[PDB]
C-alpha cells in the first residue's frame, strides 16, 4: 500500500480476533503484509483460526488472551510492540441485561485507548462502532441523511426505559452500548490529546465468509447461514429494516483506517445498500437452484436512509476496489454456489 | 413580575414538590402570585407542606399524586391546565445501583416532556438538572471553565465501569443520571420541536431552609443540618470542595426560567462560589458561640472551576436581587443564629 502510515510488517493488536468481524479485520491485515496479535477470552477460542492463519500466512499471526475488558490495565501487556490497534471486541449477544452489555462495551473501549495512549509505538487506532451508533432505521421514511455528526440518542433513552421483558430490549441495549462507547472514544481523544490518530468504522448488517464455523457463531452471517439451512433464528425478527455490507469490505475499511494518511478523525460508514430478507432468499435460490429454502417473509418495508460514505469509498478505491462488494457476491462468500 | 411570559396567576405544575429543591421552587412560584399544582408519590408526603402553603398562600397550592413517573401516561392527568411545568423529581439517594437511579431520572424527564408536548397550554418547561451534568470537579485543577456546551461525559464512563463496591459509585451513578436525562431533554426538543420552550437549571450544593423537617430529609441541607448537630453523615465524604448555592436563589432561577421572556433554551448554572466543609464549620461557630461543633476536617483545598453564570445573574437581577445570596446568609437560612 503506497504511503501507508504503518510500515510494512508492523504489528497490529486486534481485540476480539475470534469474532466474526474481528477475524475479517485480521485476515485483511495479514493479506496486506502486517503482523497481527489477536486477542480472545481464551486460547481455545482462537485455536482453529490460528491454524488457518498459520497455514495461509505462516509466522504472521499470534494468539493473546484477555478474559475481562473491564479490569483496569486489561490491555497493558498485549499493547506492547504494536504500531496500530483495532478494538473490535464488544458484546453482540443482544442480551436485554443492560449491565451485561453496556459496561464491557464502554470499559473495553476506554481500556484499549488508555493502553494505546501510554504506548509510543501506537500511531493509529481503529474502533469498530456500528451504523446503530447513528440510527436504528424505521420502514420507508424518505429524506433521512446520516453523516459524521449523527448520534443515536434515541437508543440511550430506549436502552434504559424499555422494560427488560420487551422483545426489542436487547436490540436497543446493543445500540446504546455502541453509541455511548463511540461517543466516549471521541471524548477521550479530545480530553487526553494522545499521540495516535483515531478513526471509527460503523458497519451495517455484515455478510460474508464464516472462516471457522466450528468455534465462530458468525454473528449476523450466522443468522443468514441458519436461514440458508431452513432455520429462522429468533434473532432475525429482532432486527428492523437496514443496509448490508460485505465482511471483506469491513476488513478493508479497518485496514484503510489504520494505514491511509488521508483518513484521520473520521467515522467511516460501512453501508453498501438496503436489503431485506426476501432478497436474501432470492439470492439463495439463484445460487442453489436445486435446494429448498423457506418461503418469503411478509413485506417488511425498506430502509431509505442515505449515508455519507465519502471516506468509505476513498478507502475501498485506495485499496484497489471499484466500490462496494455486491449483495449477491457477499451472500456467495457465505453460502457458495451449487455449481 | 413585569413582562412575564406566563400571565399573573397562571398554574405551574411542579413535580417532586415534597423534595427540598422542589419545595423552594413551589415557594417562590407562590410568592410571585402563581398557582401551583405540586406532585408527590403520595398525598401524605405533601401533607405538612400543604398545611404550610395553605396558611401562607391560601387557595394557591394543590397537592396532586403521581405514584410512578416511569410508566406511560404518568403525568397525563396532573398536566391539565398548566401554563408551565417544573420537572424536579429524580433519584438523589446516591445509591450505587445504576438500574435504580438512571431509569427513573431519564424516564421521568421524558414522560414529563411528552405530557407537556401533548398539552397546548404549556408554554414553558424548566428541568432541574445539576452542576454534575457538566462536571464533578477534581481538587485544585486550574483553567476549567464550564459553559452551556459542557457535558459530563466522564460520568457516563464511571457510572457504568466502576464496580458497585467503589466508594464513589453512587456519586458517579447520580452524575450520569443527571447528564443523560438533561442530554435527552435537549434531544427531545430538537427531535419533536414542541410548542413550548425548555430551559434547565444546574444547581451546585444547595443550602437553605428546610421548610418541613418532619417529612423532608432536606437532601444537601439535611447533611449540613446533621453537621450543625455534631453528626458527620456517611454521605458527607462524597461532597468534597465544590460550589454552593442558596436554595432561595435556586427557587428564583426556576421562576425566571418559567416566566422571563429573555431566558429561552438556556442551561442556567446555580453556582454562587466555591465552599468547603471547614468554611461551613467556621460559619456555625460564628452564628452559635455557645455550641460546640466538630473539629475541622482535613484541608482538601478548593474548587477552582469557573461557571458561565451570565443567564443566572440576568434572572436574579430581573427578579430584584443584587446577585447571589451569600454563603453566610444561606447557612443562616438553615440553622439560624443563637441571638
Ligand atoms: N456483524 C455486524 O453486522 C456488525 C455490525 C456493526 C458493528 N459490529 C461490531 O463488530 C464487532 C464484532 O462483533 P461481531 O458481529 O463480529 O460479533 P461476534 O462474532 O460475536 O464477535 C464479538 C467479539 O467480541 C468479543 N466479546 C464479546 N463480549 C466480550 C466481553 N464481555 N469481553 C471480551 N470480549 C468480548 C467476543 O469474544 P467471545 O467469543 O469471548 O465472546 C468476540 O471476539 C462488535 O464491536 C460489533 O458491535 C458488527
Ligand atoms: N440539593 C442539591 O444541591 C441539588 C443540586 C443539583 C440538583 N439537584 C436536583 O434537585 C432535584 C430534587 O432533589 P433534592 O436535592 O431536592 O432531593 P430530595 O429532597 O431528596 O427530593 C428529591 C425529589 O425527587 C423525588 N423522587 C426521587 N426518586 C423518585 C422516583 N423514583 N419517582 C418519583 N419521584 C422520585 C422525591 O420524591 P420521594 O420523596 O417520593 O422519593 C423528591 O420529591 C433532583 O432533580 C436533583 O438532581 C439538587
Ligand atoms: K476478508
Ligand atoms: K425559597
Describe the model:
- Two copies of one chain form a homodimer.
- Chain A is of the alpha/beta class and 339 residues long.
- The first copy, chain A, has a single domain, classed as NAD(P)-binding Rossmann-like Domain (Rossmann fold), CATH 3.40.50.720.
- Chain A is 39% helix and 15% strand.
- Chain A contains ten helices and twelve strands.
- Chain A has helices at residues 20-31, 43-56, 98-117, 153-161, 169-192, 219-228, 247-259, 277-287, 310-318, 327-335; strands spanning 11-15, 35-40, 61-65, 84-87, 124-128, 145-146, 197-203, 205-207, 242-246, 267-270, 273-275, 306-307.
- In chain A, the strands form three sheets. In chain A, strands 3-2-1-4-5-7-10 form a seven-stranded parallel β-sheet, with helices on both faces.
- In chain A, helix 6 links the parallel strand 8 and strand 9.
- Chain A starts with 10 loop residues before the first strand and ends with a helix.
- The A-B interface holds A 70, 98-99, 102-103, 106-107, 110, 153-154, 156-157, 160-161, 180, 183-184, 187 and B 70, 98-99, 102-103, 106-107, 110, 153, 156-157, 160-161, 180, 183-184, 187, 191.
- Residues 24, 27-28, 247-248, 251 of chain A line the site of one potassium ion.
Amino acid at each position: 500500500i503506497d504511503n501507508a502510515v504503518l510500515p510494512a510488517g508492523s504489528l497490529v493488536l486486534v481485540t476480539g480476533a475470534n469474532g466474526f468481524v474481528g477475524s475479517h479485520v485480521v485476515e485483511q491485515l495479514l493479506e496486506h503484509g502486517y503482523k497481527v496479535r489477536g486477542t480472545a477470552r481464551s486460547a481455545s477460542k482462537l485455536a482453529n483460526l490460528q491454524k488457518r492463519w498459520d497455514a495461509k500466512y505462516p509466522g504472521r499471526f499470534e494468539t493473546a488472551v484477555v478474559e475481562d475488558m473491564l479490569k483496569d490495565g486489561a490491555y497493558d501487556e498485549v499493547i506492547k510492540g504494536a504500531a496500530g490497534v483495532a478494538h473490535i471486541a464488544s458484546p453482540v449477544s443482544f442480551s436485554p441485561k443492560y449491565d451485561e452489555v453496556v459496561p464491557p462495551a464502554i470499559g473495553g473501549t476506554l481500556n484499549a485507548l488508555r493502553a494505546a495512549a501510554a504506548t509510543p509505538s501506537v500511531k493509529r487506532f481503529v474502533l469498530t462502532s456500528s451504523m446503530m451508533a447513528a440510527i436504528v432505521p424505521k420502514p420507508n421514511v424518505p429524506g433521512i441523511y446520516l453523516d459524521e455528526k449523527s448520534w443515536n440518542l434515541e437508543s440511550i433513552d430506549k436502552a434504559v426505559t424499555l422494560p427488560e421483558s420487551h422483545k426489542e430490549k436487547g436490540l436497543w441495549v446493543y445500540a446504546a452500548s455502541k453509541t455511548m462507547a463511540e461517543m466516549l472514544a471521541w471524548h477521550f481523544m479530545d480530553e487526553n490529546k494522545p499521540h495516535f490518530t483515531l478513526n471509527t468504522v460503523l458497519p451495517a448488517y455484515t455478510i460474508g465468509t464464516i472462516f471457522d464455523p466450528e468455534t465462530q457463531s458468525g454473528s449476523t452471517s450466522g443468522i443468514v447461514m441458519k436461514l440458508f439451512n431452513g432455520e429462522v433464528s429468533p434473532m432475525l425478527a429482532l432486527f428492523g429494516p437496514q443496509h448490508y455490507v460485505s465482511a471483506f469490505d469491513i476488513g478493508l475499511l479497518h485496514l484503510g483506517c489504520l494505514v491511509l494518511p488521508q483518513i484521520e478523525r473520521r467515522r467511516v460508514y460501512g453501508t453498501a445498500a438496503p436489503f431485506d430478507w426476501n432478497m436474501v432468499l432470492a439470492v439463495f435460490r439463484k445460487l442453489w437452484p436445486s435446494k429448498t429454502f423457506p418461503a418469503d417473509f411478509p413485506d417488511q418495508g425498506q430502509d431509505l436512509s442515505v449515508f455519507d460514505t465519502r471516506p468509505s469509498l476513498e478507502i475501498l478505491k485506495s485499496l484497489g476496489r471499484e466500490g462496494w462488494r455486491s449483495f449477491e457476491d457477499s451472500i456467495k462468500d457465505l453460502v457458495g454456489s451449487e455449481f
